[PDB]
Amino acid sequence: GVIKPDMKIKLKMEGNVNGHAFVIEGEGEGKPYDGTNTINLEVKEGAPLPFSYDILTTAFNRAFTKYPDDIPNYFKQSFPEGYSWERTMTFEDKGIVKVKSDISMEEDSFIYEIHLKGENFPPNGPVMQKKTTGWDASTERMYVRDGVLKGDVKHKLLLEGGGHHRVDFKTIYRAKKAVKLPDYHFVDHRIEILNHDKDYNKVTVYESAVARNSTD
Amino acid sequence: HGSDLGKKLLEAARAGQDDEVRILMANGADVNATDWVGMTPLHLAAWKGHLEIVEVLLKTGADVNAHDVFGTTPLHLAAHRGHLEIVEVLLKAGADVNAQDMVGKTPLHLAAYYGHLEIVEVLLKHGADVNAQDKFGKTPFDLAIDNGNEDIAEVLQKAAKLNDYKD
């Protein structure tokens, strides 16, 4: 089909977090049917970033999700035309991120155009002081409302001390054409920074994601 | 309620349902409905290229200069996508030709970056600031160059030279 077992990734993010503007471009690759992908990211404008890179990494495509055959695949069905998604992340100390992404496909590459705004992060909290270590593994609840697919995650952002910062993810995923809608189900995630230089001007992100039914 | 139809209006504009849109507006739908990322019906129609819905929304009171949470205006979006006719009706309806989004980009920055020469020309004709700088100090000329849009870069360079001869 149009989604090959190996797909490349090209993306641009335009960002502004607590007034700091930046642009990040990435190139990557993954295996959509295995639910795994990696992206190499470079800050093209606004280097060095004065905040935790972890608030960006989940913005850097649920086409990369292993789905069992008894759950309709909202994301893969949407191609070649693709889909967009919109997300709010509400942080424990009142920081908020709003993210929008448009996912298209050109030959054997997915293309993402991302806008991300972060605001109200405490100047001395762990995001702006770069005291995060990464995301915990998570489970996203996927459910259909208003003819589109929604995802909710009660997430934890892990902190350098060993504690954690609760972050609530709400996402709306919007196919650009009609598709068969799934029932309520889960998507388990693991996301990791595999490499970064000292300032996180260069970063490689890895994510795995598997869908499963609600009972199991 | 204006609000609850406003939400159906957002959906109709996003899906391209010119008739739905018109039906919903006749029945009182809030033309300035917004969603959780600050998109209005006008933003959505401008991005999708639904010219007829753009016109209808403008005639019935839509805010031509609404900004979404990223500082993006309908004119940014039409310029980004190359919707020349929508760029023209937005400008005629009062769109701020020099609005800046959250990274400092004007509609001219986007037209230059995404290679839409006719939009570049309309925007300059309507007073777009050819020397506008984004938050990184880049001009529309710099973006044209970075993306290999030399014809646009030539147009911008000429307009910048000529602009040095005002009073």
Numbering used by the authors:
A (entry chain A): 2 to 61, 65 to 220
B (entry chain B): 12 to 178
Reproduce text from the manuscript describing this model.
Here, we report the selection of designed ankyrin repeat proteins (DARPins) recognizing mTFP1 (monomeric teal fluorescent protein 1). Here, we report the selection of DARPins recognizing mTFP1, one of the brightest and most photostable FPs in the blue-green spectrum. We characterized these binders both biochemically and biophysically and determined the three-dimensional structure of one DARPin-mTFP1 complex.
Gel filtration analysis indicated a homogeneous 1:1 complex, which was used for crystallization as described in Materials and Methods. We determined the crystal structure of the mTFP1/-DARPin 1238_E11 complex in two space groups, to 1.6 Å (P6522) and 1.85 Å (C2) resolution, respectively. Both complex structures are structurally identical (Cα r.m.s.d. of 0.3 Å): The overall fold of mTFP1 exhibits the typical β-can motif of the GFP family and undergoes only minor structural changes upon DARPin binding. DARPin 1238_E11 binds into a cavity along mTFP1 including β-strands 1, 4, 5 and 6, comprising a protein-protein binding surface of 790 Å2 and thus similar in size compared to other known DARPin protein complexes. Residues from the N-Cap and the three DARPin repeats make specific contacts with mTFP1. DARPin 1238_E11 binds along the barrel of mTFP1, using hydrophobic and charge complementation.
